[PDB]
Design a protein around this ligand. Structure first.
Ligand code: HEM
Ligand code: HEM
Ligand code: HEM
Ligand code: HEM
Lengths: 141, 146, 141, 146
């Protein structure tokens, strides 16, 4: 359960990302594909080379879904219903992978927001990304 | 793979009682029913809409036999799982695009099926040995991923 | 979420377990300690030898908690409240262990319910145990 | 460790720049704040009621440095992590009763702290080599569990 202080921490941290959200998205994906190569099995149709337009483009989409989640933090299941449907019924990504993307997003935020990535904020973001993952895998079966 | 002699004998002892045909079909089928997202790799197999459609699907059953035939062969080369499964590892990665977590899920479902068929005979020590073996096979199949 | 069918499947299977619950809980613990030795780090104060009275007595408590969850299948978060606080704040068992015990319980049920452990029921039981684990792990942070 | 020469080299080059005092206290403190159930092993350290309490705790700092010193030894022994950490593995299992899953949590937190400290210098390739190292260390520390 996200607390009021968690919600505040995430909104704050995500606020500074602001216009860079898309770049951070792409960066998190690149870090996942390199660090956890099994995640590439879900993107056989992508050019995964560094600098790929596919990865950039997809990074933006992920980052925008995350902005939407932050904006609707009190009502995530509703704001992400369509995405949950998609991952559960069409894409069918094994649930273990969400933890891997979550970790890479955290590393990306840490590398870009040294002032904002305090221990309390790190904790809230970790919980937030876990909550997002739960919502996205809630309709699998 | 830390398999002790007694672990190895127990694995082989039981494996000689298995109707690999039947068991392969039950394990693959159960995987598709219990963890339905694994159905994403088998759309060409036709109807997988209900438990009966999956469990009795002739293509599921025939594929399961193939899977278990490869597994048995692994059981005859427990000291070299990596070499034994190298070509299959490459195939599942490079051509089939299968997340190796799927190998872990199948292994655990295989353990339930063996329990179901052997009842008491599948004692805790025997289960413990089979857990090591299914993790070793899964790891061998994942080893050529890149 | 559990479906009406799932609920029917779980009540029927556990109903057949009946008065053997405690013994199956004890066997599930034995299978866990042997197959996944890392779980033993949580029970250093127990005698873990085969047939141990301590293991038998703990298997009964575990089994009774599940029986109660089955008895209150439409209100599990509330029925398991006390147990969720205990595992989160006193015991502090890492969440990955819940899947291990769940798997061993299923193996235990399969070995004892040849006729009832059909594919539909196995699937319902897997979801049920995952639901129980989510509840017991919901207040960790 | 299947570490590439270029992987070994990247790990080593970054590590020569690490302030162990700062990084150790930060990693250990962060583990306890982000995954508060790990506090169960550190009751004797004092107040751990808040992030500031944790981060400020001098026993947390001093123990962090020690942990990271041990981590440094591993980097000098990358081709034999198992023998390198055999005693420490035994100790974490038989005397301290620490679930090895905790080793994996600490590893990822460490990666987050290296990123926080090195910023852009902690590129995706560097991260990838460090993920292999932290997994290697965790596995070596879990190796003598029984
Ligand atoms: C933080 C959790 C995640 C979020 C918020 C997320 C978000 C999204 C979004 C917004 C889309 C595009 C849908 C559209 O076109 O409108 C997408 C698609 C997709 N996602 Fe995720 N995703 C997440 C995790 C994952 C992970 C863990 C995987 C597997 C490693 C994955 C694999 C995919 C794939 C394969 C597509 C389709 C891409 C394509 O064909 O263009 N996602 N996701
Ligand atoms: C014990 C683990 C496994 C073994 C030993 C194994 C072995 C095999 C074998 C022998 C084949 C036929 C190869 C060929 O056509 O040349 C095959 C094909 C295949 N495998 Fe596996 N497999 C295992 C697990 C899995 C799992 C868990 C999945 C995914 C859920 C999977 C996905 C597939 C797919 C999609 C094919 C091709 C099916 C087709 O003919 O269209 N495998 N595997
Ligand atoms: C199916 C999920 C589980 C349920 C239903 C369950 C249930 C229980 C119950 C009823 C108790 C006794 C509380 C009392 O004294 O009244 C207990 C205690 C305990 N549980 Fe769990 N548990 C579950 C999973 C786990 C797991 C995965 C672990 C760790 C591997 C664990 C470790 C413990 C420990 C160490 C105690 C204290 C035992 C003692 O010192 O007497 N439990 N649990
Ligand atoms: C990178 C992984 C880790 C390494 C390399 C490591 C290393 C060490 C070392 C060198 C000591 C000092 C032993 C002595 O001489 O008494 C120690 C103690 C200890 N470790 Fe770890 N450790 C690791 C992770 C963990 C984690 C994740 C936990 C639990 C969350 C943990 C729990 C403990 C405890 C409780 C002590 C005793 C501390 C005291 O009270 O003096 N360790 N560890």
């Amino acid at each position: 359960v996200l607390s009021p202080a968690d919600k505040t921490n995430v909104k704050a941290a995500w606020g500074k990302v602001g216009a860079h959200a898309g770049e951070y998205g792409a960066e998190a994906l690149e870090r996942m594909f390199l660090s956890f190569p099994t995640t590439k099995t879900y993107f056989p149709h992508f050019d995964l080379s560094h600098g790929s337009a596919q990865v950039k483009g997809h990074g933006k989409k992920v980052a925008d879904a995350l902005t939407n989640a932050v904006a609707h933090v009190d009502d995530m299941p509703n704001a992400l219903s369509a995405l949950s449907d998609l991952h559960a019924h069409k894409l069918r990504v094994d649930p273990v992978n969400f933890k891997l993307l979550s970790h890479c997003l955290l590393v990306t935020l840490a590398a870009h927001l040294p002032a904002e990535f305090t221990p309390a904020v790190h904790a809230s973001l970790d919980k937030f990304l876990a909550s997002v993952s739960t919502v996205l895998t809630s309709k699998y079966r | 793979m830390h398999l002790t002699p007694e672990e190895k004998s127990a694995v082989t002892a039981l494996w000689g009682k298995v109707n690999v045909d039947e068991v392969g079909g039950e394990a693959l089928g159960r995987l598709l029913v219990v963890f339905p997202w694994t159905q994403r790799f088998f759309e060409s197999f036709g109807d997988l809409s209900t438990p009966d459609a999956v469990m009795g699907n002739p293509k599921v059953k025939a594929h399961g036999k193939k899977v278990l035939g490869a597994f048995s062969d692994g059981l005859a080369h427990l000291d070299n799982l990596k070499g034994t499964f190298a070509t299959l590892s490459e195939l599942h990665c490079d051509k089939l695009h299968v997340d190796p977590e799927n190998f872990r899920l199948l292994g655990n479902v295989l353990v339930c099926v063996l329990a179901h068929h052997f009842g008491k005979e599948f004692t805790p020590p025997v289960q413990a040995a089979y857990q090591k073996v299914v993790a070793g096979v899964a790891n061998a199949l994942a080893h050529k991923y890149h």
